[PDB]
Amino acid sequence: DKVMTKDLEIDRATREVIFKGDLITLTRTEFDLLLFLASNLGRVFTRDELLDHVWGYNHFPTTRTVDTHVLQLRQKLPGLEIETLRGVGYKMK
């Protein structure tokens, strides 16, 4: 029910945050980000992952949408010379 860290006492039911004894008001998205990290101590999340977990999936375009749009272009235009630079991005030859 309550998530506890060294500094934090978080109540998922009420959006309540106690930090070093003080009640701190966060926005809803600030709260979601804080609770997600506090529930997953010691774990590194990429900026892409945190965007998805805080704001939710499929509400707006993300870098994933770029990737899936490229794949759809390749299927509709067979042999389209878009080159993948893995870990980087895309180029049209």
8 binds a copy of itself (CB under 8 A): yes
What is the number of other CB atoms lying within 10 angstroms of the CB of residue 73? 13
Position 16 contacts a copy of itself (CB under 8 A): no
Give per-residue burial for 43-56: e unless 16+ CB within 10 Å, then b. eeeeeeeebbbbee
Which amino acid appears at position 29 of this protein? T
23 binds a copy of itself (CB under 8 A): no
Q: Does 26 bind a copy of itself (CB under 8 A)?
A: yes
Question: Does position 3 bind a copy of itself by CB under 8 A?
Answer: no
Between 11 and 67, CB nearer to a copy of itself? 67
| Torsions phi, psi for 32 (to 5 deg) | -60, -40
Question: CB of residue 58 vs a copy of itself: minimum separation in angstroms?
Answer: 12
Report the C-alpha gap between 9 and 17 in whole angstroms: 6
For strands 89-92 and 8-11, give the pairing: unpaired
Say whether residue 4 binds a copy of itself (CB under 8 A).
no
- Binding residues for a copy of itself, per CB under 8 A? 5-8, 17, 19-20, 24-26, 29-30, 33-34, 37-38, 40-51, 54-55, 59-63, 65-67, 69-70, 72-73, 76-82, 85, 88-93
